């Protein structure tokens, strides 16, 4: 089991965070309802994105405070667990390079 996407690498002291509405990786295999999840912090810390209701924190409800978990949602997303998307089997699929809309605000020491 794995994130669908490559990691965001923390090169500085600042932790990963996003303004509300920003930070969900682009995934054209998903729809507007699906655009919601968390980054989990795994040399420079690597943060990996998982859809809500999937991954190591599959049971964790959106917004719940927890060390090393950063919540992201695009306006229009729904609260349902993203069971249909699930996680990646790295034996079958390489990670998708993580892409964010141009002009997405990133903290110092992050690049995407």
């Amino acid at each position: 089991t794995a994130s669908w996407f490559t990691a965001l690498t923390q090169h500085g002291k600042e932790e990963l965070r996003f303004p509300r509405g920003q930070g969900v990786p682009i995934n054209t295999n998903s729809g507007p309802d699906d655009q919601i999840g968390y980054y989990r912090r795994a040399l420079s810390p690597r943060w990996y994105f998982y859809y809500l209701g999937t991954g190591p924190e599959a049971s964790l409800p959106y917004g719940a405070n927890k060390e090393g978990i950063v919540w992201v949602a695009t306006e229009g997303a729904l609260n349902t667990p993203k069971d249909h998307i699930g996680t990646r089997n790295p034996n079958n699929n390489a990670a998708t390079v993580l892409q964010l809309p141009q002009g997405t605000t990133l903290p110092k020491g992050f690049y995407a």
Side-chain angles (χ1 to χ4, degrees), residues 15-64:
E15 269 198 9
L16 190 51
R17 63 154 302 267
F18 286 101
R20 173 84 243 94
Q22 304 243 120
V24 176
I26 303 169
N27 183 1
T28 48
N29 300 321
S30 69
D33 293 343
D34 300 322
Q35 304 304 306
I36 178 163
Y38 58 95
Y39 284 85
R40 175 176 182 265
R41 185 176 58 220
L43 300 194
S44 315
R46 304 144 75 36
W47 298 77
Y48 290 93
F49 175 87
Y50 294 89
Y51 288 96
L52 182 65
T54 72
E57 305 302 313
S59 63
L60 220 218
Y62 187 87

Side-chain angles (χ1 to χ4, degrees), residues 50-112:
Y50 294 89
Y51 288 96
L52 182 65
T54 72
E57 305 302 313
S59 63
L60 220 218
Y62 187 87
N65 192 82
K66 178 165 179 170
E67 167 176 42
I69 300 305
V70 165
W71 287 107
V72 292
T74 304
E75 247 73 19
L78 305 186
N79 201 224
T80 50
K82 317 303 177 195
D83 281 15
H84 288 268
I85 290 166
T87 51
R88 186 178 50 98
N89 186 343
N91 300 300
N92 300 329
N93 297 274
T96 298
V97 170
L98 200 160
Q99 299 186 234
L100 290 172
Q102 201 182 119
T104 294
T105 302
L106 281 177
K108 261 188 261 62
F110 287 96
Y111 311 95

